[PDB]
């Protein structure tokens, strides 16, 4: 499964990455607007995003992917510091730390579910 990371951390970035890598086929982007191309240029089967980012913070990523025809489908998980009905939501929603174990299984279920 394509797994699409964005996270402007390159340490965090890089360690959900290499964590993933085992069962995932994780691609990675320093924020939403390299994701956003990278993603409708091939789209991923599941997204993993941050929140409250330098640029255009993770909602609004969401936002793009559920008015993209083509990405409208890509389940999407965010991972946070943080803990209305016309706005995107994510399918899934982790707070850091988070443990690895939990990721996973989390990823497995949505792709799932989407399928």
């Not at 320093?30 to 091939?42: E, F, V, Y």
Request: hydrophobic share 45%; glycine share 6%.
């Amino acid at each position: 499964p394509k797994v699409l990371i964005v996270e402007n951390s390159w340490t965090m970035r890089e360690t959900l990455r290499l964590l993933l890598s085992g069962e995932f086929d994780c691609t990675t982007a320093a924020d939403g607007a390299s994701g956003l191309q990278q993603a409708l240029a091939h789209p991923p089967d599941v997204l993993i995003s941050d929140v409250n980012m330098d640029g255009m913070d993770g909602y609004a990523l969401c936002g793009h992917f559920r008015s993209e025809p083509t990405l409208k489908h890509i389940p999407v998980i965010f991972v946070s510091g943080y803990a209305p009905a016309d706005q995107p939501v994510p399918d899934a929603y982790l707070v850091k730390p988070v443990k690895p174990p939990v990721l996973i299984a989390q990823l497995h279920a949505l792709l799932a579910r989407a399928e």
